[model samples]
Target: LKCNKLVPLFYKTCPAGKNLCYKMFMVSNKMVPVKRGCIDVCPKSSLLVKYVCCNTDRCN
Candidate 1:
């Protein structure tokens, strides 16, 4: 997955029970990606922030 400033490119192994790949976007600092990883469930989008969930592998 490619995400954030730190973990830009890498293969992330999802733990047991987590089935969705999620990516977070932020808008305060001129709109950019914030985070990406695997989660059990997708989160709701908010003002200035957004969450995107994908079912395929490395789809974040």
Candidate 2:
């Protein structure tokens, strides 16, 4: 037998004029810890988990 892995979205937030962040990765056989970084400062966006660098509208 065989299997695949991917995050199925764990959480969500509201970022109207801003942007949101989504994190997913290999954690065994599924995509766990789906989190968000509701548009904000650069650093505080994501404390530990690394996120894509973006400076979009509302600086999300």
Candidate 3:
């Protein structure tokens, strides 16, 4: 996938404190770290952090 497509998605799905996890995925798996990179690249702007952690599938 293209960087533009992947980057926005990563930011939306990644958890705030779990940035390292996302980073690792990018480095180890060659996946894009969209959200963290987006925030870093564009500070002071709100990006959509879509995925939220939950204990149950009921929320989904």
Candidate 1 accuracy as lDDT = 0.61
lDDT of 3 by residue, 3-60 (tens): 2223434323433542222111233334334333211222222333223223221222
Give candidate 2's TM-score: 0.23
Candidate 1 lDDT by residue in tens digits, 1-60 = 222212455555666777777767676877565677776447777876677667666554
Output the better candidate (2/3) by TM-score: 2
Q: With candidate 1 superimposed using the best TM-score fit, by how many Å does residue 7's alpha carbon deviate from the native? A: 2.4
- Candidate 1, residue 47: the lDDT equals 72
Estimate TM-scores for all models. 0.63, 0.23, 0.19
Flag regions of model 3 displaced more than 4 Å.
1-46
Which candidate comes out best when scored by lDDT?
1
- lDDT tens per residue, model 2, 1-60: 010112233233344654434332224445343443444332434333444423331212
Best-to-worst TM-score order? 1, 2, 3
- The window of 10 residues in a row where model 2 has the poorest summed lDDT is 1-10
lDDT of 1 at 34: 68
Model 3 TM-score is: 0.19
Residue 21, candidate 1: Cα error in Å is 0.9
